[PDB]
Amino acid sequence: REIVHIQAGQCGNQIGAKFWEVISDEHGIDPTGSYHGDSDLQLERINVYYNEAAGNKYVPRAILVDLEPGTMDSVRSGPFGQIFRPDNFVFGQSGAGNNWAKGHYTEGAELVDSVLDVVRKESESCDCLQGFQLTHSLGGGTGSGMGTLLISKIREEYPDRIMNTFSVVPSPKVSDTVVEPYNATLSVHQLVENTDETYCIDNEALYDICFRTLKLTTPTYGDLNHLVSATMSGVTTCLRFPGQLNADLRKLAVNMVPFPRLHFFMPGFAPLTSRGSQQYRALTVPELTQQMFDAKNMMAACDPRHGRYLTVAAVFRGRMSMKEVDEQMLNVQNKNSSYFVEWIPNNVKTAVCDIPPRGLKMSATFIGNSTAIQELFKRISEQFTAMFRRKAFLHWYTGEGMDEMEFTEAESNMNDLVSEYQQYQD
Amino acid sequence: REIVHIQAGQCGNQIGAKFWEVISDEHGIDPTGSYHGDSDLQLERINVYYNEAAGNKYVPRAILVDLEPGTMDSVRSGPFGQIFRPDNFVFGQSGAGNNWAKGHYTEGAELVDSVLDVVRKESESCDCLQGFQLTHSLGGGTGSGMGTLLISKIREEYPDRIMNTFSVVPSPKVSDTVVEPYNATLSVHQLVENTDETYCIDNEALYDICFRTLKLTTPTYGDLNHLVSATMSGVTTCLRFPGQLNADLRKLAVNMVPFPRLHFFMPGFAPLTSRGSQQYRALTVPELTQQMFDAKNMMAACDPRHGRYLTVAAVFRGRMSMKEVDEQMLNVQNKNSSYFVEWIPNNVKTAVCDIPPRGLKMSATFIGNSTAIQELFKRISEQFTAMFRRKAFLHWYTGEGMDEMEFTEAESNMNDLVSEYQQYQD
Amino acid sequence: RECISIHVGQAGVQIGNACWELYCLEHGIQPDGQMPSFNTFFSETGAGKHVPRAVFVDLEPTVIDEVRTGTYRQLFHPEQLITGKEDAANNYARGHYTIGKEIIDLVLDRIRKLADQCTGLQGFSVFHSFGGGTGSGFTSLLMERLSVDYGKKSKLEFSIYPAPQVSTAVVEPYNSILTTHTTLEHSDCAFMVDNEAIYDICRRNLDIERPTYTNLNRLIGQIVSSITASLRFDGALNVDLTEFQTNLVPYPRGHFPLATYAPVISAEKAYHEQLSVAEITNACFEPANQMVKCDPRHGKYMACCLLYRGDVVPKDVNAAIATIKTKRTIQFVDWCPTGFKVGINYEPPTVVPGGDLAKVQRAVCMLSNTTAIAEAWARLDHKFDLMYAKRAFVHWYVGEGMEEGEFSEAREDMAALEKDYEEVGVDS
Amino acid sequence: RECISIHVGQAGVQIGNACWELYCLEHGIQPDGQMPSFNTFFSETGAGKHVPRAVFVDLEPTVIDEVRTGTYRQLFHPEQLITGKEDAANNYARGHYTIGKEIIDLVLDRIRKLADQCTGLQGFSVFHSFGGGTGSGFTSLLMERLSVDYGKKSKLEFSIYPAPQVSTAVVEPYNSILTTHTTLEHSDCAFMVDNEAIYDICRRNLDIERPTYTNLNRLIGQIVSSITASLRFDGALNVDLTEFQTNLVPYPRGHFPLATYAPVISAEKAYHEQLSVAEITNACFEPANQMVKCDPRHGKYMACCLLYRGDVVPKDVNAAIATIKTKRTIQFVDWCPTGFKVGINYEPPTVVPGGDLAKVQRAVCMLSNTTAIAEAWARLDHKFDLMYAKRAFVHWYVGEGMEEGEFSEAREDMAALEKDYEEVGVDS
């Protein structure tokens, strides 16, 4: 029944800053820590993410990890940085510098032991864990590097808990680190087989949505990470709150994974349009389904109609008829039958929660597992190869002891995921 | 049951500005978007042209298209530009310049893909489309050029929907573009076989009516486009509102087209006289029929008594007896038997709606398909030939890749319509 | 002893509106169905509400919506009110085939439901118009199914006869020609009236120069009620609908009895004038009260049925008949002796409150089959021919799957029909 | 004369919520249990509070919490409300095995406690859904134990039939195939309904285009009450649950009678219309009121049971039967003569205050076993096959200890079942 969340890397720490904000919004918990809500449900299932400390203080069940105090400090300095206890800030001193080898292989490795100890302390604080969630970037040093290391140890300690992670996937246009594909390649090599599932977030796609449908001209990462948190929070609240359908994360995982190795997801979100049009929108189930199916409302820079859909999850929040939902999903399946895989009859699955997100009447979360995902892997693998041959920045990595044959195997493994998507693309 | 309207070119955009104004007048919809009427019927069939967006906002089911933001902006700046959603403004940057080649063949072609995507989004928003309507100029770059391109694709997607268009036909005296007949020729070549029907509006004739019977000395295009919208709105309201006769657009199309290729129409309108005489007018069915038959009340610079009438539609708005209408139409047929074609017994058909246009007790719309129409084609074809031989401005067109043999075929096709009118003129 | 009314198309439904209004007037039926008091047409609920056993079909929502928003919206069961979204467009090709054929199954199942509600289905009658898309297109489609399921039940049709001078439908000849082809062969009897002729009646007998359809249909309703309400009510000679068919249809082709109705008199014209049964029947043989513009003196009679309301004594009727048989110029076909059906109901004639016709104490309806009808077909023949020779408007049917041969064929069937009239005219 | 209701899973519990609400409506039971007035279902306390003899199982706290916070939280005994912490995840492998198997012992002991409270346990019935983790997983687990302890008691199951078009559970075929394998062999009879078909009923007979599960379950509750409340109440022909089994199950396989219910009528549709027993039963043989999307005309009937509420006279029933036997197109299997069980209760039909269905004075429930069910299995066969051929989602079961052979086997068992339907279809 409970979940532990660990954030890492500057990305992960800033995403989590919005995530937790939202969760407390959902439950009426004040930036200082106490509960000042107003709904029974708000406290009722609070356990999944909060420990109530003496005084009616709620402690977010999460660990903030970094290798630079300053980022942690900036998190702590805002509202909701006060709700986190000092003991959840685990950090070192001297960066990682966006270096996998430092993060995973060497220096960051040193910190992980202290992180894990706190993890253990929290695992004991829970009655019964459902699982763990981690937030991070695929091409980052602590985000992926150190984060991955941690994941391999947590999974080891808890094989029976859900291990998932959401991660920022290097967008085709904006890479920061020259070896960002290298770090990503290494994380695939480690993560894929050490996780139950991973979500693919593309900032470029997010920037398109924010202007494309939301028509906004000023977003920052906090605004885009709001959208990220909308999908993350969407998933777990249902599990938390009363609904109609089947509201268990593990069951979601079961329904979305047809094969042990292909567990990559494309998140999307509805409704998600500018205020101008809000006066011209109608709120129906087909309306949400139109926004959910549309590739432009995906947060991943993929194109599901290019690939084939293996699995689709449609999560609904708010009062909807069962009939309408059933029929519209069927219609989707029918009309987009050319994209769905024939091996899975009725490949579109649903989940229904009766609690709407604060401020909306209804909402829906799109989760997909298509073959289209392989295109991201292909882009990375290719870029990787070029760098691999030149050893760009690999003296930094090999200087910290990372061996090229390990990287070679990582490359293969990327290619293996692509070939397996091809094996089920048919 | 529903209709989608697309406006294009400076002409089309300004005509539509009046058209939609009128439609909202008909239904009591405020310039800001909400419904503030007062009749049951006003909302009852609103679906054909409006989507009700959340908040009791009505969205006109139309797309505004241009290649210059400034025209679009001017439309948006007035009342009823606020009722259109931003998503219905599809435009590029850099004109067309009244160049078919740019509009259709090259640059404007690029925009059409985004237009069509929105079209598709609206086609899904409808329950069941009856058809589509487009407003444009025959000699214009985006009006005809880009507009035509769009039509060919919409027809392709929806063979089973009505495709009609109203278009400004180059008046004998006022052409703006030197190659306006060229653009028109090309549009015939493309449009005629890619449309179910097209209406022929002559500004010169309109300027004569406004002074001839309306005795006005200040009109602008907004006043003349009011008259245009009177005929357009006249047609669709009946379809929308309760009547006596047969109020379906497709049925109108069926009754007015005797031959696959000859679908050109001459709109006219009654009552349509100055206020002075309004104190000396009587309102009877023969009164309307006198105004309807009279060639001077036609909006097309043709002369129906010069040619032969193939089909006539008389649409009536307001309470009239069936007897009177039947008898007067018969009388018309009888007295003007020398103009009607002998192959079609009882060539004058009627349609009756019981809802009068706001402010009038009664009104009638004249729609005709005569052979006289061919005279317009003849004027254009001739002018075309001269230009064709000289290639006036064709370096602009051939510079954008338009081939002269395509134009040659276009010329033939114009001549073919004339010969077919002759074939049924007898 | 039950029957079903079917209203297809605007004409069918708007006429029906008048018809059911009149039936309400016949018994004091409230808009909500409450009747304080004719179960041959109506089905009773435990609230004492009665439902008119009828089906309303329109492929365009509007007219049915007009019903749905009027007073009789409470009377009609929502399932009786059937509507599509799109029209036939004046066109058999869509009415019978492309469009109407999609909804007809629903329509039939509502009919069948009512047929199951009937305990002794005597039969039914269909109200429509010869020129329209649903009016004639869909209509024949229905007959195609109804004649299978209800093969032994009365199949009476009532249709508006296309006015020779005014018609709003340019392809009406084509529509009507196609219906001939398909209705002749399926229906039992089709009746028709001419709105132009009716206008002349309104202006000469009612003195009204402003008739609308809402006037015109009241007059039609009168005629219909004489044969529908009063034939179920008590009289001397209670004539059934099956009896009507058995007394009006002489050949297995169709036949097309035309309506004539006298009295049609304005209130002022009723003053100072005393009608007798005989005088009313004299009026019935006058061209002037002929409801179709076709000259009674041109053709020869084959059938004739006179139905009486109110103060009618058979004694007087007998005398009247004697004079119409011998005094008039009514030529009749050899085949027929003058066995004219006399229906005599004690049930008085009724008048619509706020209507044009005067309160009368007695009334006579006349049905007649005359050879002059071939001229009506001749009218259609040339109108069709003209269009068809030029092939004007042909693409509006061809695009829906119609065949040119079919159209020729249908004309030929009409020609055959005309020839059979020719045959009957030849006395033998 | 007692029985136990078992509600497993959301579907089981939320349907149960409607069911127990209806039983409260049947007798005027207050939320606190106070009843001023059916002890076959209820157990009485000295306060005059009655406890519904039922068990509620959910492995996720939420739905039971919904009960615990609603009005009926006072009605239910805290021990009846059993909850785990984690879910089955749509998955038999956890529902039947890994997770649900841990709590089941508790569940069984509460059942046994109630069995000891029963003095004359007639039997019980289980409410669930064919696709879910607890809905079908846990459910079959329970049957495995209940069939041992209560081997001679009624084992009736009610389950939601997976909609062919909409399903939220991608591995539902796999779940349902596994249940077939294990339920066929243990249960006595399983009934099922299709929410999609129900939607069509709601929109056509109730005229509602917005059905939620809380509407859908009211309709289900109606059907259930006819066979649960009214079978314990007085009538002419008082039919027991064991009698139901003894009159509905023809073979030792299972059988799967499907529900049909007529009247399902909106208040406005009830006006102006008089239903008789015969008319209601006519509706019962119409595809249109079939609660499962499966065509009654496709298959052949094997069993049929008609249960009557309110104003039903056997006299009329007899006539109705005669016509359904002879008038209809109902083909039936040789094996069977038409011995259709007629249950006739004087107990009137009841309606939920604020519901959609009209107050009716009489009502008929129909159970039927048709050969068309094999097509439902065919649907599952291919859906399963597709997934299984690709081995999509297989790791979610394998990781819990499931065997691939087992899955093949379960499919084969389904195939055998289809073959037995084939067999029955062959007349002999």
Ligand SMILES: *OP(=O)(O)OP(=O)(O)OP(=O)(O)OC[C@H]1O[C@@H](n2cnc3c(=O)[nH]c(N)nc32)[C@H](O)[C@@H]1O
């Ligand atoms: O709309 P569609 O063509 O699909 O079906 P219809 O309803 O048959 O078409 P419509 O064009 O309305 O048919 C018109 C013919 O019928 C006459 N008519 C219309 N409404 C009438 C009415 O209320 N009463 C009478 N007596 N006649 C009516 C028209 O004159 C025309 O011939």
Ligand SMILES: *OP(=O)(O)OP(=O)(O)OP(=O)(O)OC[C@H]1O[C@@H](n2cnc3c(=O)[nH]c(N)nc32)[C@H](O)[C@@H]1O
């Ligand atoms: O949660 P878990 O999978 O472990 O158990 P379930 O409760 O069986 O799962 P769930 O996913 O909710 O099963 C859903 C199936 O049952 C239908 N359904 C849900 N709730 C329903 C209700 O209240 N009434 C009806 N009639 N059907 C209900 C869903 O359509 C789905 O097929």
Ligand SMILES: Nc1nc2c(ncn2[C@@H]2O[C@H](COP(=O)(O)OP(=O)(O)O)[C@@H](O)[C@H]2O)c(=O)[nH]1
């Ligand atoms: N959405 C999102 N992406 C971020 C944020 N911060 C850094 N990123 C992305 O993360 C990548 C850089 O890795 P970084 O987080 O600096 O690594 P680390 O800090 O060394 O672990 C780039 O692709 C950025 O676009 C953020 O707050 N939101």
Ligand SMILES: Nc1nc2c(ncn2[C@@H]2O[C@H](COP(=O)(O)OP(=O)(O)O)[C@@H](O)[C@H]2O)c(=O)[nH]1
């Ligand atoms: N009635 C009418 N004609 C117009 C309007 N605007 C331009 N026109 C006519 O359109 C022709 C010019 O084409 P234009 O609309 O400028 O082409 P485009 O803007 O490049 O697509 C001329 O014949 C004008 O008389 C208008 O608002 N009303």
Ligand SMILES: [Mg+2]
């Ligand atoms: Mg559940």
Ligand SMILES: [Mg+2]
């Ligand atoms: Mg009509």
